[PDB]
Design a protein around this nucleic acid. Structure first.
Ligand code: GTP
Ligand code: PHE
Ligand code: FME
Ligand code: MG
Ligand code: MG
Ligand code: MG
Ligand code: MG
Ligand code: MG
Ligand code: MG
Ligand code: MG
Ligand code: MG
Length: 393
RNA sequence: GGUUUAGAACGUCGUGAGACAGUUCGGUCCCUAUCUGCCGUGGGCGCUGGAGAACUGAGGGGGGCUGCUCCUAGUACGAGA
């Protein structure tokens, strides 16, 4: 916290996606070192990304570790999700902010079970565009075998609603480009070109009132409690009133300071990932899941009508009916919450692969409006997405 | 140290002397090796004229334990761990 971040170049929220032990932290670490040397960004290393006793004794990503690197045209803000079966909740918070993704497949193994589950989760939340990166290559010195894997990735995307053949499948090692090989360094500089060319400049909302869903809370020793998250809409100013709304109850506060990757900001606008400092609030009372709205706009609710689209075996969901009393997990913006379903009159059962309305009573109150969407999950697998119809409370 | 001498006590059994894999405190462990055996170490004669060396090797003996850490490799395997 020292340098004022000057607002040059359009901000793009990027993140990696992939299977476990399949290239991801190494991919980001290579992007950090390569873009530092040629284009003249900040250095950093692979050690600073993933850290602590829990992510070393095993050697896996559990929390969402972020990076900020720059190119001539645009400015990027990377996110490394955990990619594993047990940590799928905190993966969704990183994936929700992401506009243009970097999928990671491997030329040795190929497609894996969670590579399918990641892409299935992304569309229901909000991932318009996606790029593939074959992160091994050099392990198999053969032209025929490597190109057979390229064919399999186009099938995954085209089956599950995407361009498929139009998506640029770049190839190359991360470990060779990390240390400094001239042929492999330039092949990741080519991926930087595809991030600019393929993914467009995302359209932000700088008009409708201020909102900020919290992905993860912090406690800076000196200043107080800080809350990170993408500014989903509107603008923030250092001094304005900020009514916290969500789980538990509803608190009043003021914005002490906005920052972007340990650098100051006056006007933190919509689209970019910023960490807002609060006035006289503790680490205990503020929870991961709540939202920072402008006073008077949004109101907390725990009962709502919604036209939910349940999925069948073809898309990816259930294969059996269910009566009232069913309690799955609802993923609104960032965090999950349980809720009992109440079906309408003249509706005995809910078959899979059907379009119906339903009143859902949540256990906690969460803020919502008419137009918002979510993705239901239960039993380590998806159920179906929907859209909010009417507020009831 | 224990169990098995003589002293003493408790509990129990006995009229009592005393008794009890019941308990308790105290209580002399001798021998210079002839022979076999064994570990060493010589003298004698032999090995066919005598002497000094250096070998060969039948045969015999000794020795043979094993952890942890890296590399291959976070590779095969495994949906993940
Ligand atoms: N030889 C080679 N090894 C690679 C390459 N990319 C990744 N690896 C290996 O894979 C390991 C990195 O695993 P990650 O993908 O970071 O594991 P992770 O963070 O759990 O992955 P996610 O679950 O996707 O978050 C390293 O120890 C590398 O040895 C590559 O291009 N070539
Ligand atoms: N807005 C944050 C993003 C972040 C979240 C969590 C960990 C690290 C970084 C910056 O810094
Ligand atoms: C004085 S009582 C002696 C008991 C005898 N001891 C050695 O032979 C037994 O047998
Ligand atoms: Mg990682
Ligand atoms: Mg591992
Ligand atoms: Mg004694
Ligand atoms: Mg005695
Ligand atoms: Mg004595
Ligand atoms: Mg003696
Ligand atoms: Mg021998
Ligand atoms: Mg051995």
């Amino acid at each position: 916290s020292k340098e004022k971040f000057e607002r040059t170049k359009p901000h793009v929220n990027v993140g990696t996606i992939g299977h476990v032990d399949h290239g991801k932290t190494t991919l980001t670490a290579a992007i950090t070192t390569v873009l530092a040397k040629t284009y003249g960004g900040a250095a950093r290393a692979f050690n600073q990304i993933d850290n602590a006793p829990e992510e070393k004794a095993r050697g896996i990503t559990i929390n969402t570790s972020h990076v900020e690197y720059d190119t001539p045209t645009r400015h990027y803000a990377h996110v490394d999700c955990p990619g594993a079966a047990d940590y799928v909740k905190n993966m969704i918070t990183g994936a929700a902010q992401m506009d243009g993704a970097i999928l990671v497949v491997a030329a040795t193994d190929g497609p894996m079970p969670q590579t399918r589950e990641h892409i299935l989760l992304g569309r229901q939340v909000g991932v318009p565009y996606i790029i593939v990166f074959l992160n091994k290559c050099d392990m198999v010195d053969d032209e025929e075998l490597l190109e057979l894997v390229e064919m399999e990735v186009r099938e995954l995307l085209s089956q599950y609603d995407f361009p498929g053949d139009d998506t640029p499948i770049v190839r190359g090692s991360a470990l060779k480009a990390l240390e400094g090989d001239a042929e492999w360094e330039a092949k990741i500089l080519e991926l930087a070109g595809f991030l600019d060319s393929y993914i467009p400049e995302p359209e932000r909302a700088i008009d409708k009132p201020f909102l900020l869903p919290i992905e993860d809370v912090f406690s800076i020793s000196g200043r107080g409690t800080v809350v990170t998250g993408r500014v989903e809409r509107g603008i923030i100013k250092v001094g304005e009133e900020v009514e916290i709304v969500g789980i538990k109850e509803t608190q009043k506060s003021t914005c002490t300071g906005v920052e972007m990757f340990r650098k100051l900001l006056d006007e933190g606008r919509a689209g970019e990932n910023v960490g807002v400092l609060l006035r006289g609030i503790k680490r205990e009372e503020i929870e991961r899941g709540q939202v920072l709205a402008k006073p008077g706009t949004i109101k907390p609710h725990t009962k709502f009508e919604s036209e939910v689209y349940i999925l069948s075996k073809d898309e990816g969901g259930r294969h059996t009916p269910f009566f009232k009393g069913y309690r799955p997990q609802f993923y609104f913006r960032t965090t999950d919450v349980t809720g009992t379903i109440e079906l309408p009159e003249g509706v005995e059962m809910v078959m899979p692969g059907d379009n119906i309305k339903m009143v859902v009573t949540l256990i906690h109150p969460i803020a919502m409006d008419d137009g918002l969407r979510f993705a239901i999950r239960e039993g380590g697998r998806t159920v179906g997405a929907g859209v909010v119809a009417k507020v009831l409370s």
